Design a protein around this ligand. Sequence first.
Ligand SMILES: O=C(O)c1cc(-c2ccc(F)cc2F)ccc1O
Ligand SMILES: O=C(O)c1cc(-c2ccc(F)cc2F)ccc1O
Lengths: 374, 370
Amino acid sequence: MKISVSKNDLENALRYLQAFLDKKDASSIASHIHLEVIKEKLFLKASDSDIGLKSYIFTQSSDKEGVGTINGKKFLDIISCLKDSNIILETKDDSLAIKQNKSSFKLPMFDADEFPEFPVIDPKVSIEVNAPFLVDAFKKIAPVIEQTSHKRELAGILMQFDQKHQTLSVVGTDTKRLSYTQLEKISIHSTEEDISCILPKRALLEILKLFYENFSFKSDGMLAVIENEMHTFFTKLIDGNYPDYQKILPKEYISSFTLGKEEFKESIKLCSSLSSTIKLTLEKNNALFESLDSEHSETAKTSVEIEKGLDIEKAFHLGVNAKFFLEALNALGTTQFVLRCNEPSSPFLIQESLDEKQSHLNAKISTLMMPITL
Amino acid sequence: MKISVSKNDLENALRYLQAFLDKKDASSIASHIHLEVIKEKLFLKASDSDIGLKSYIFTQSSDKEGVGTINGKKFLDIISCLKDSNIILETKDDSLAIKQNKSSFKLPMFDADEFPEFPVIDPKVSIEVNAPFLVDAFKKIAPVIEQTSHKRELAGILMQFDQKHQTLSVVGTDTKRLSYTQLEKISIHSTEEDISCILPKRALLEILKLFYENFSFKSDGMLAVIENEMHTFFTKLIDGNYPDYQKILPKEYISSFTLGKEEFKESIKLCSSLSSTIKLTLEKNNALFESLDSEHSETAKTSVEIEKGLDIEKAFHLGVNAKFFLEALNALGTTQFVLRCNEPSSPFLIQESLDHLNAKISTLMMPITL
Ligand SMILES: O=C(O)c1cc(-c2ccc(F)cc2F)ccc1O
Ligand SMILES: O=C(O)c1cc(-c2ccc(F)cc2F)ccc1O
C-alpha cells in the first residue's frame, strides 16, 4: 500500500469512524480501522455484527494498492497534529508509515482478514431521501426513546412504510409520551405493501451525525443500510412488533387550545426549578403554572395572558411532567401550539399550529402524553 | 427584609457565589447564601470557615433592612429563568419570597445566626495591586500546583514578601517542575522585613475568576483577604514552611539555547500523540523531536530548522516530559525561549528571551533519563 491524501479529507473521515471503535484495548483489532486502496480511493471501515461504517476519500496520488489496518484513535490524534497539506501513507510489512514534510510516524498493522465482512443485503424496501424531513423527524423524536425500555421494540425508532399510500410514518415512545409523524408522498419501492423497520437508539444517534439529505435507506427486514456519496452505514434492526400507535391515539378531542410556545416554555422552565411536575390551569384569558411535586415549603408560580380567548366555560386543570412537556414543545417548528384534551386524567396531545397543512422540507411531530393526577 | 433589585445585577452576583457553596446537601446551611439589606445595598455572602465571598448590589427605591438565607443553587436557577426587569425579594417569617410581576416564589430560609461570621483581620502584610502582574503570575503558575498534593504546603501557591527590597516572589511546584517569578518594585507594607503566605489551589482558582487589577491583598499570617470595589474574598492559608526554592535553582548552566516557542510547542504536541515523554536532539542548525516512552513499534518524529546556529560541537540529547515542557512554554510571553542545561540527567530551566504589566515566569524541570 502507498498513497497520498488530503489531510482535511482524512481527518474528517477519521472523526466519524471513532464511534464504531472499541478504543480502550489498543491491542485488540476492535480498536483498529480496516484500510483498503482500490483504484483512486482509500476506503476506511470500522464495524462489527450489529453496527458499522464504511467511508472513502479520493487519493491525490496512488502508487500501491492493497489492504491494511491501523489503531483508529492514534491515527486521528496524529493527523489532527499535522498541517493542511497532503499526507503520504505507506506500508512497510505490517506497519503503516505516515509522512508529512519533516514529520514521520510508524504505527503497527494487524491481520486484515481478522476484520469482519461488511454486510450486503437484498432489499425488501428502499427509498431515496432528497430532503431533510426524515433526519428532522429522527432528531425531534429521539429524546423520547429509552434504550433501556422494557418492551424490546420501544428501545428503537419505528419506520413504518405504506407503499400503497406512499407514507413513511416515524414513531417513538417510552410509554409516557409517544411522538409521531406521517411523511407524505414518499417514493417507496417495496415488495410488500406494509413493512416495518425498528432502528436501535444507538444507531439512530449515529445516523444524526452522518446524514442529512441525499442518501438512500434500504432494508431486508433484518439490517438497515444507509448510503450517501461518502458513507455506507448499517445497523441491525430490533426484531418484533412495534405496537399500533394509531389505536393508542384518542379518536376525538373535547377541547383544542391554541397557545404560545415560547411563553409556555419559559413558564414551565421557570416552575421546574423546584419540581419535575407542574399544575397547569387554563382559564379564558390566562394560563397559570405552579410547581406541584416540590418539597413542602417550596412554591413557584407564574401566569401568562392569553389575548385570543380560549373556549373555557370554567377552568381546565392539568398535571404535566415538566421535562416531557418541554421536549414536546421543543419538537415543534411553529410559534404557537395546539393542546388537545379530553379529561384531566386521560392522554393529551401537543402539536403544531396548522398541522394539517402540507410541508416539504421539515417533519411535523405530534406528541401524545399521559398527564399527572391532580 | 425587603428590596427591589436589578435582575442582571442579581444574576451576575449569584453566579460568582456558586463556587463558594456546598450544593450537594441542600439541608445544610453550607448550601445557602446569606442575604442582608442595609441602606441602599443588598449584601450576599457564601462561605464556610475555610473560604468565602461577600458581594453586593444596589437598589434605587425604598427598602426594609434585615437578614435571611436561601439555597444558592435554587436561587440562581430561579433568577436565570426570569425576565430582564426588577425583582422584589422579601422575608416572610422563615421563608424568602421572590416576586417579578406575575411570577412569585417562596423558599425556606435557615437561621441566619448559624451563618459563619465573615472574618476581619489585623493585617501583618498589605499590598495595593493596580496592574495585572499578580493574577498573570497566578494564572501562569497554577497548572504546576496539584491540589491533591500529599505534601500539604505544596498544595498551594507561595507568596514571599520582601518588605526591605519591595519584591514579591510567587512560586509553585509539584517536585518535578518548579515555576517562579520575582515581581519588582511593589509597594509592600508589612510589620516584618520578610513574610510568606501560601494560598490553597482552590482559592487561587477562585481569585482568577474574581480579580484582575485594582484590588488590595491583606493577611495576618492565617487568612488572606482580597478586596476590590465589588467583592471581599477570603481564604485560609496553608500552615507550614514552603521549601527554600532558591537553594534548588542551579547557579550556573553549561549551555544556553535561544529557540522558537511555537515551533517547539507544535513539535512536542505532535510527538506527544504517541507518548508522554520526548527525546529532544539539539544540533547546530536543527532540533529533532522523537517519541520516547511510546509503545513497541509506535514512533512519532519531526524536526525544525534553526537558522541562527546553536553553540554546540556534538549534538545535545535531552529527555523531557512533553506536558510539563508545553506548560512551561505556555507560561512565556515571548516568541522565543531560552533553554538552559547542564548534563542530560540534571535539572534544566526554561525562561523568556531577554529576562510593568506582565510577570515573567521561569520554570525549572527534572529531565527524563535517555
Ligand atoms: O404499553 C403501553 O403501556 C404503551 C403506552 C403508550 C402511551 C399511552 C398513552 C400516552 F398518553 C402516551 C403513551 F406513550 C404508548 C405505547 C405503549 O406501548
Ligand atoms: O520535594 C522535593 O524534592 C522538591 C523538588 C523540587 C524540584 C527540584 C528540581 C526540579 F528540576 C524541579 C523541581 F520541582 C522542587 C520542590 C521540592 O519540594
